[PDB]
Amino acid sequence: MKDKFLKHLTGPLYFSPKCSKHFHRLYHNTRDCTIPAYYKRCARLLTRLAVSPVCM
Amino acid sequence: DPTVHWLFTTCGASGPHGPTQAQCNNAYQNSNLSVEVGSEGPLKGIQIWKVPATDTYSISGYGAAGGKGGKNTMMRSHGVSVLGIFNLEKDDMLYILVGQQGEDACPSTNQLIQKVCIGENNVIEEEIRVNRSVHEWAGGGGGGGGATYVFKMKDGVPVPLIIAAGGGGRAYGAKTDTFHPERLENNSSVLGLNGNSGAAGGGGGWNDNTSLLWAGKSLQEGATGGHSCPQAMKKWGWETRGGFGGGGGGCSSGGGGGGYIGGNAASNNDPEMDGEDGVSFISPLGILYTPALKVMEGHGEVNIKHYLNCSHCEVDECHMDPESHKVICFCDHGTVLAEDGVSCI
Amino acid sequence: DPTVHWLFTTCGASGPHGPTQAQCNNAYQNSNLSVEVGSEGPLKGIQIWKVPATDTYSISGYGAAGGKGGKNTMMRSHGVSVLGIFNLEKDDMLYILVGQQGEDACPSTNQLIQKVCIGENNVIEEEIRVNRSVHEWAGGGGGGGGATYVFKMKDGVPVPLIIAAGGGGRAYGAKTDTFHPERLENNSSVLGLNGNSGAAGGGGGWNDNTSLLWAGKSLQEGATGGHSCPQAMKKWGWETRGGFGGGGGGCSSGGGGGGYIGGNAASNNDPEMDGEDGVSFISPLGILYTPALKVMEGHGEVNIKHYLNCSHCEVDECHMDPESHKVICFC
């Protein structure tokens, strides 16, 4: 319900296990991804996370 | 209550100079936040905050984005976010400088510069075609974003806790939207110098002496936003000053962004070299929660909340369900939380 | 055809007037996009796009955010996002009006006005102590946001495909941040009127006759952003105009938001009543992807890409490889 939209904004990005831990942190405990009005910000964050070499 | 949090904004201010006491008092009406703002001296616009109870706090520092270029179509360099996990005592003083966005090249209320912006006036393009660089007609380059600082006053000298770097300014002819990997400093022994300034203004660092009116100032000099290029004021009617927090000003090159170490700018007046962003900082006294990532598009901000101490479950990471006030601890590696709510299966 | 999408923006333009041909040619240099911009009439600023293939396309329209208030501390009302699934024929002339952000109340270049904005002046604050009605000076309301329109012609008559409503304006006394539930309309039989305009300008709908100067225009008459209220025009010197795409006019209240139906403004000059949002629209010929959500913080945009047939097989989710058909449903 709030994940397909974020998937559309973000695109096909894959996450490694440690990166999955950081993914959980941004996705649940950062208010950019909690409240609906900052999804762009959220999406941006996720994108940048995938850029880091810790994320496959 | 887990939901309680304090949101420090730029108090409605913008541009090279930070907020006043009245701005922050108006910005925090009918809320749970109250700050005092330094009126004079290098602490002008820095919001002091008293920690209400001793606890473990998560601090979210968001820097500010840079300014758009003259051909304001390429996206602005975004401001960096740092999450830190710190521990705070009663009556502690947290000095928070919230970063401010660098001023854009376009639009401009000046009529001549506006006619330049809409493409009817294109003398800058002819100058680039002739001299391969800008020397006469200094074009609109975006101002550097201001860093976000959360620090404290221990017995005479400030001690940094959270620094979120500011987005660099976008040059006049920035044909590339590629952004460099974000830079983070986890060690306090590395000096917080200022960014290099050429024609445009390098970003402001932590503690460095500024001799340039267009470069951003370090925090120990007030950290006011830098002025524009000297050629931007002569034979031109526009200025693009960097935001408060060390944001460098915008010449035909790009304005550097602030940080623990300030962002760079082009040594010459290259109309296509965007300004480098700053270097963020995380204190050894706290725990870094997530890496440094470019997120912000406008003014910086600070979000301080009670950290969810949830080492009670087997996995070190957990979160609060918006639907249920119950905490939810998850299991990675495809493991599934057991019925006990701690174990994994 | 890996990662072939086209992004339509405001071409670097801002304020109440749409982009022209020069700015859009400047915006789409060294990219896979080329547009034409109308030069006059109701289509001045609306971008021309040729559909490259007869295919199913996903079109995502993001409206523009409204302007911030005089005490520009609260967040601006966000532009609504509409995602749709459409079927497009070869060589269609799509018409794309990209909404522009409503102008903020503060800062201003005037010295007296900046002195009001920072806090040294309180004539508005004292004025709401002596008669509680802002009519001698005018308060600070950001302009309404410019809606995002993607439409086409049949028989020379416009046909709405994607309409994403623009953000309402932030009033002076915007002490709260609540927003009304996001209004989406699917049936096209309801006419696209404009919002109510009182002291501040309502939003500009799909097609309506707008006579008020401060109100925003509907698309079939230009969709120009309105001017500020005349009380702010004289002896107060405020020019907080709206955004391109039906952006309402800033006054003590908030400017209404553009959309298929424009955002209603305040009939009275209430400095604590903000600018209402517009009504977004999805075409009957398209498929709604996700509920409409207030998302964008600045100038709106449009993203068009080829739609991926995830639901062509049993599994509803798929992620095709760049060069190979790697949709997620195992055989």
Residue numbers in the entry:
A (entry chain C): 93 to 148
B (entry chain B): 678 to 1022
C (entry chain A): 678 to 1008
What does the paper say about this structure?
Anaplastic lymphoma kinase (ALK) and the related leukocyte tyrosine kinase (LTK) are receptor tyrosine kinases (RTKs) that are activated by binding their cognate cytokines, ALKAL1 and ALKAL2 (also called FAM150A/B or AUGβ/α). Their signaling outputs elicit a range of pleiotropic activities in development and metabolism, and their dysregulated intracellular kinases are keenly pursued as therapeutic drug targets in various cancers. Recent structural studies revealed ALK/LTK-cytokine assemblies with distinct stoichiometries.
Here, we show based on reanalysis of the cryo-EM data deposited in EMPIAR-10930 that over half of the ALK-ALKAL2 particles in the dataset are classified into 2D and 3D classes obeying a 2:1 stoichiometry besides the originally reported structure displaying 2:2 stoichiometry. Unlike particles representing the 2:2 ALK-ALKAL2 complex, particles for the 2:1 ALK-ALKAL2 complex suffer severely from preferred orientations that resulted in cryo-EM maps displaying strong anisotropy. The combined use of Orientation Rebalancing in CryoSPARC and 3D refinement in RELION v5 with enabled Blush regularization, resulted in a final map at 3.2-Å resolution displaying an impressive improvement in isotropy, as evidenced by the 10-fold increase in the cFAR score, and overall interpretability. Most importantly, post-processing in RELION yielded a sharpened map with clear main chain connectivity and signal for most side chains, allowing complete model building of a 2:1 ALKTG-EGFL-ALKAL2 complex that includes the membrane-proximal EGFL-like domains of ALK. While the majority of the 2:1 ALKTG-EGFL-ALKAL2 cryo-EM map has a local resolution to better than 3.5-Å resolution, the C-terminal tips of the EGFL domains are only resolved at 4–4.5 Å resolution pointing to their inherent flexibility. Most importantly, though, this new structure is now the most complete ALK-ALKAL2 complex with 2:1 stoichiometry to date and agrees closely with the ALKTG-ALKAL2 with 2:1 stoichiometry reported by De Munck and colleagues featuring site 1 (ALK-ALKAL2), site 2 (ALK’-ALKAL2), and site 3 (ALK-ALK’) interaction interfaces. Accordingly, the root-mean-square deviation (r.m.s.d.) between these two structures is 1.3 Å over 675 aligned Cα-atoms. The site 2 interface present in the 2:1 ALK:ALKAL2 complex, but not in the 2:2 ALK-ALKAL2 complex, involves the α1 helix of ALKAL2 with a key histidine residue (H100) interacting with S737, Y739, and L760 of ALK’. Due to the asymmetric nature of the ALKAL2 monomer, the EGFL domain of the opposing ALK protomer (ALK’) in the 2:1 ALKTG-EGFL-ALKAL2 complex does not make any direct contacts at the “site 2” interaction with ALKAL2. As a result, the ALK’ EGFL domain is less resolved at its extremity due to increased flexibility, resulting in the absence of density for the minor β-hairpin in the cryo-EM map.
